[PDB]
Structure 1
């Protein structure tokens, strides 16, 4: 079985990069240089506080 897919192509606009200005309240696609390809973040404990940038 090899059914045709004549679904109309969508119009898309190519841009070279994601937002440069946004720093909060949004996701940022990127190529993570890790072995784990999921949403990864460095480990923590009480030895290491939370960011004190309030």
Structure 2
């Protein structure tokens, strides 16, 4: 079977990039340079505290 998919085509507004201003409380679509793909971060322990920037 190859049924047709006639559902109307939605609008969409092209833009070159994401928000340049936003720093918090959001996600950021990006092309990461990892072998892995996924939400991944560098490991930590007590040897390395949390960020001290408060």
TM-score (norm 1): 0.98
Corresponding residue for residue 45 of structure 2 = 45
Structure 1 unmatched runs, 5+: none
Q: In 2, distance between residues paired with 1:52 and 1:42?
A: 17
1:1-49 deviation digits (Å, cap 9, x = unpaired) = 0000000000000000000000000000000000110100000000001
Q: In 1, distance between residues paired with 2:41 and 2:32?
A: 11
What is the aligned length?
54
Structure 2 unmatched runs, 5+: none
